[PDB]
Amino acid sequence: MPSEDYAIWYARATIAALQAAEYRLAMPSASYTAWFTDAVSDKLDKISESLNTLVECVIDKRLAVSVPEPLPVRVENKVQVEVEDEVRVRVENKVDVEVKN
Amino acid sequence: MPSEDYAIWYARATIAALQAAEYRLAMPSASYTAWFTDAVSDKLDKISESLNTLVECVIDKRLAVSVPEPLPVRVENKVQVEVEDEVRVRVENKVDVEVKN
């Protein structure tokens, strides 16, 4: 029943108005926030929980770590030592001696 | 088509209405959610999956680490040592002796 001329103008004028305006979001519906919680927020909570588990290892601005024990090592240098016991020895060569008695 | 005065009224009144309202989002379309899943949610899953792998290394607030085995070390101090075996020796000097015979 609306004339074609009016119907044409209505569609064109309504599209022009919709595009001229800007849209202020309200609080979303519960259906949107449920979706968004699954798509984003719950995943952020899991990421934050995992990060926290790692950061609880930080003490005094150092990350506490654990290594196998005892830790296998190779000493690469010549070490100065102090011998604490009397040592049993086997003399292997013929020794020059000065008799003092 | 309606008069210019009517068209001007309609454009202004409709824009005014669109901007006076606030908009409550519903569940998005399947097309929007598929796009958003690729743009955001799937990437959050990969981030969470990578963090999970790191956090599996944590036990009692210490991060388990691995170093080369065996680890090359350099001993910096003078070490007290206890010699446990008999030692073969070569006497390099002429020795003063007292004969107890």
Added chain:
Amino acid sequence: MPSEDYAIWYARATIAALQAAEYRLAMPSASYTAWFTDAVSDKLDKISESLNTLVECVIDKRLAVSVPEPLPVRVENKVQVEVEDEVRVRVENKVDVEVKN
């Protein structure tokens, strides 16, 4: 009511107009921004803060770590040593001697 023909036209024309337009978001309302900050922004702050605690441990492109100390180690190689002080010894064998006087 208006005509059933007019009503069908109006539904089709209005949906077609709404779907032909594109929608420019303004700054959201206070209701939305409060929800969004709780759903996203505050969780990002929490993540950022935890990460900063970890990254504070990084010094000049190395992560500072703490290991139990003194660390138990097991030395796997034969170590060169230097004996600095006089060692007390006990000769275990009969020594061949050349008397020089």
Added chain:
Amino acid sequence: MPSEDYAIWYARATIAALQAAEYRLAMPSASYTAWFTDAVSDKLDKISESLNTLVECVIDKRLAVSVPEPLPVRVENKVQVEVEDEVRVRVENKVDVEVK
């Protein structure tokens, strides 16, 4: 040229209908997705890629690390040792001997 009553009604009724409806988002325009990619998705990619570089270091639930080598250490205890070579010695004292 609508009547004033109609103009007043149309403003109030249109606001009411807009507030009562809920709005289903379609696939966004290319302009929106281009902007959103810059604002969000590209930064998520950078974050994910940085995390992967760190997580490649994880081997069987341990983080592979590197320390300066050789690692400087201080031995805190007295060490039992086994001498494995013949030792050149210089005798310092006058030795008591029993002949043959």
Added chain:
Amino acid sequence: MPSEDYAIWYARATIAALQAAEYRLAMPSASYTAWFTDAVSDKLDKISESLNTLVECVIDKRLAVSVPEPLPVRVENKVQVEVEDEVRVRVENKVDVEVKN
């Protein structure tokens, strides 16, 4: 001014059209992008910046770490050593000798 029957039909029909349609987002207003930059993007940037600092420590698929130097260790095993210098010794016992002259 319209009749109540029209007014009621218009409200019901317009809500029905608004809910039957779906909405294609254009590029958002400057107001929106400025708010969104503060609420999300700038926080992502800080997260990425902090993560970059940690990942700079990765070299050849290992994380570079620092421990206190020198690190205190406890040697748990008996160590084989090679003495490298001449050793001054004091003979503590009476030595049996075979005179070879």
